[PDB]
Every structure is written in C-alpha cells, then in structure tokens.
C-alpha cells in the first residue's frame, strides 16, 4: 500500500480538539505514540482550558484507526493506512440516549513525521442534569466491535457502533455512533469488504499531573475476515 510503509515503526501522535458543549467551550491537547505493528496506542490528553465540562470517557472515540493492526491476510482491507499520508476526514454524530448529541469533524493526516488528529466538536441538547453534564459516568471503558463497511459512492467507508458507558449507579449510558470517512486527497484508497475492529481500552491518571487529564491505552485489531 501507499501508506503501509509509514506505519512500520513507532509513530508520534498529536491530537488537537476544540469543542463547545451547550455553550461550554473547551480545548484539549494530546500527545502519544502509535505502533500499528501491535495495534497499540498510548496517549495523554490535557484540558487546556482548565476543567473538562464533559466526562473524559465520552471523548475517547473522538480523540486514529490507522493504528489498528491488520493481520497479513486482511491488509487489502485497510482503508485507513491506504489514505496516508494525505489523510482522511472523519465525521461523526454521536447520540447519547435520552440526552444530547455530539457532532464532530476531524482531519487525520501526517504533518511531517507526526500523525495529526485535528478535531472540531459541537454538542447540543444536553441535559444540564443528565449523565454527561452531571458527570455521572464512571472513569472506565469497555471493549467494543467497530463495524466497517465500504462507501462506493463516496469512495470512503461507513462505520456504526454503540458504546456502553457505565454509570455510577450500576446503570448504562448508551452512545450511538454514526461515522463516515473520506480521503482527503485525490489519490486512490483501498475500499474494504465488511469487517470489524476489535478495540480494547484502558483509562488511567498520571499521579504527577495536576491538570485535568486522561491517560489512554488501547489495542486495536482487525477481524471478521
């Protein structure tokens, strides 16, 4: 592939997000590394504007699937890497059941040797007293399957999945994702056959960090083929 070669080693990652949730403006910066050979990700996020108005777990999916590990046999299905280094646009609408929804637009691409994820996030119809704004979500995360399907008309892919956020009371906060990716350039990309990504994540904190943050560790692997 065209991008395959870019992911042979450990790649530095840079994440920049600008968000507004119900008039609550904020900014997050993240740094880390990605090692596609192992579908491994390590990222540290910082709320630059002070305290995050939403719960960290809600931003996880938002904050680089090109770091997924595709087994040799599945390489031809790797749309993500194939779009590099020009990059791709990642757009989403995330509906929190019985609550507001997030609308995101991101650009994933290389800036020199660093992989960049620049995001704009807009959140509306949230309940000032709900699970989100009310910060009732637990600081954790579960493993999920991300279903991938090609989008011929748009020379990109469509992804759909649900995230299940644990609430402090033992209950669950549902987050339905609708996702579209399209190549930035005019270059060719690989259009995959339906398959999925198996994602596992772990959230932590840095004892030395005084600022509001989140440390994330993920492992991602393609399957279903």
Curated annotation (Swiss-Prot):
Organism this protein belongs to: Aequorea victoria (Water jellyfish)
GO biological process: bioluminescence; generation of precursor metabolites and energy
Outcome of swapping residue 151 to V: In EBFP2.0; shifts the excitation and emission spectra to shorter wavelengths and increases quantum yields compared to BFP
Transmembrane segments: none
Gene that encodes the chain: GFP
SUPFAM superfamilies on file: GFP-like (SSF54511)
Family stated for the protein in its record: Belongs to the GFP family.
Mutation effect (residue 163 to T): In P11; increases fluorescence at 475 nm excitation and at warmer temperatures such as 37 degrees Celsius. In Esmerald; leads to brighter fluorescence. In VisGreen; leads to brighter fluorescence
Biotechnology usage: Green fluorescent protein has been engineered to produce a vast number of variously colored mutants, fusion proteins, and biosensors. Further generation of mutants led to more stable proteins (at 37 degrees Celsius for example) with brighter fluorescence and longer fluorescence lifetimes.
Name of this chain's protein: Green fluorescent protein
Modifications after synthesis and translation: Contains a chromophore consisting of modified amino acid residues. Maturation of the chromophore requires nothing other than molecular oxygen.
Key words, A-Z: Chromophore, Luminescence, Photoprotein
Tissue expression summary: Photocytes.
Function of the protein: Energy-transfer acceptor. Its role is to transduce the blue chemiluminescence of the protein aequorin into green fluorescent light by energy transfer. Fluoresces in vivo upon receiving energy from the Ca(2+)-activated photoprotein aequorin.
Impact when changing residue 45 to L: In mut3.3; shifts fluorescence lifetime from 3.03 to 1.88 ns. In R10-3; matures to the red-emitting state with excitation and emission maxima at 555 and 585 nm, respectively
Subunit structure: Monomer.
Outcome, altering residue 220 to R: In Azurite; shifts the excitation and emission spectra to shorter wavelengths and increases quantum yields compared to BFP
Phenotype when changing residue 202 to V: In EBFP1.2; shifts the excitation and emission spectra to shorter wavelengths and increases quantum yields compared to BFP
InterPro entries: GFP (IPR009017), GFP-related (IPR011584), Green_fluorescent_prot (IPR000786)
Impact when changing residue 68 to A: Increases fluorescence at warmer temperatures such as 37 degrees Celsius. In GFPmut 3; highly fluorescent mutant when excited at 488 nm
Reported effect, residue 64 to N: In R10-3; matures to the red-emitting state with excitation and emission maxima at 555 and 585 nm, respectively
